[PDB]
């Protein structure tokens, strides 16, 4: 029975991280009074840890923002081109949001452009679509939520060329429609645009915290 004892502490490891917080530790051994015959053993811990603080922030890379709204469909040097066979060009923008501390810049193109036909406010013939899928219960966690589905006046797009060669760009680019048209349709239940019906939602459950609700059902 020989008492174990600690020796010298080893060299502390350098702060491994180049940003924010890290961790260092030291390693000592019970080799100075080594325990013999298993009677006693060295007490305490053979590894102590410490937090090394570096003030520099860490590079947070930039994530793309969601696409903005399509720009108005215009043709150069023609002003308005609504309700006509005139191919325009509309753009859409993003935002490289979050690039800080030498973070990697956003990769890609921040500007999307497509060829378009303008159909803003144009009166068109319409036809009543079928009953849409029953929407959500709204307002959730509100007084008496009510579902709602709706039939609406679907405009009939004019049979224009969906594939046009651009003289300036020397390309055969696709053209899609953009705008809010004014459709015409026979009245259905006294509405010229959109007729809907609401039904209250049944057995509405209370809105509580996901943890609190979990603990409530478990406890009864």
């Amino acid at each position: 029975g020989v008492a174990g004892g600690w020796g010298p502490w080893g060299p502390v490891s350098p702060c491994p991280v180049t940003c924010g917080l890290g961790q260092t530790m030291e390693q000592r051994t019970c080799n100075h009074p080594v325990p013999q015959h298993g009677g006693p053993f060295c007490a305490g811990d053979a590894t102590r840890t410490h937090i090394c603080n570096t003030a520099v922030p860490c590079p947070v890379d930039g994530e793309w923002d969601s696409w903005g709204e399509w720009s108005p469909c215009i043709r150069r040097n023609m002003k308005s081109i609504s309700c006509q066979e005139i191919p325009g060009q509309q753009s859409r923008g993003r935002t490289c949001r979050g690039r800080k501390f030498d973070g990697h810049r956003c990769a890609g193109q921040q500007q999307d452009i497509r060829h378009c036909y303008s159909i803003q406010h144009c009166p068109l013939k319409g036809s009543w679509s079928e009953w849409s899928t029953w929407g959500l219960c709204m307002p959730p966690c509100g007084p008496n939520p009510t579902r709602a589905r709706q039939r609406l006046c679907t405009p009939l797009l004019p049979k224009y060329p969906p594939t046009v060669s651009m003289v300036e760009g020397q390309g055969e680019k696709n053209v899609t429609f953009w705008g809010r048209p004014l459709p015409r349709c026979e009245e259905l239940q006294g509405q010229k645009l959109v007729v809907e019906e609401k039904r209250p939602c049944l057995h509405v459950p209370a809105c509580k915290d996901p943890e609190e609700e979990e603990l409530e059902n478990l406890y009864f």
Binding site: V17, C19, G20, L21, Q23, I51, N53, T54, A55, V56, P57, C58, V60, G98, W134, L136, C137, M138, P140, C141, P145, R147, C201, L202, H203, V204, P205, C207, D209, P210, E211
Partner: protein, 165 residues
């Protein structure tokens, strides 16, 4: 204000994993945006990245097993120093209520019919058992219904006859 600092954030679980230490302000811990913090250890684990809406959870079970019900799912804004889409503070919850249907019918229990006549005594000597059965078809049950009680009463009978020694 000190706070517990964790080295990894596990998405879709809402938990802080890999403890580094406490007694460190929220600013120092969140210098690495991949970290996460939890205060007082009760919960509320939060990543250090820019606040962005989490994922829609699985639908809670339908409020009732019968006909039309309602079910919810949550989405919490997770992040530090910032706002989610819609001028929302970190820690706020958005909900979506939806109508659900587990099954069409539901158990309408049936009623008992008239009693069947008493069956003869189960034995010809000493004492036996006299059974009395009915049916659950007045009216008949639908879906998963059953009649309340039992369908066969059983009593005792004395034949008043001795068995051969």
């Amino acid at each position: 204000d000190p706070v517990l600092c964790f080295t990894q954030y596990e998405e879709s679980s809402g938990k802080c994993k890999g403890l580094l230490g406490g007694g460190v302000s929220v600013e120092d811990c969140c210098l690495n945006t991949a970290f996460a913090y939890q205060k007082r250890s009760g919960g509320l684990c939060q990543p250090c990245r820019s606040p962005r809406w989490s994922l829609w959870s699985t639908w809670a079970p339908c409020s009732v097993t019968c006909s039309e019900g309602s079910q919810l799912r949550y989405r919490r804004c997770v992040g530090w120093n910032g706002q989610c889409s819609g001028k929302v503070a970190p820690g706020t919850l958005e909900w979506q209520l939806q109508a659900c249907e587990d099954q069409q019918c539901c158990p309408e229990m049936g009623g008992w019919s008239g009693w069947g006549p008493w069956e003869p005594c189960s034995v010809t000597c000493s004492k036996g058992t006299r059974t009395r059965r009915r049916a659950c078809n007045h009216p008949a049950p639908k879906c998963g219904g059953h009649c309340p009680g039992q369908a066969q009463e059983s009593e005792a009978c004395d034949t008043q006859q001795v068995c051969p020694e």
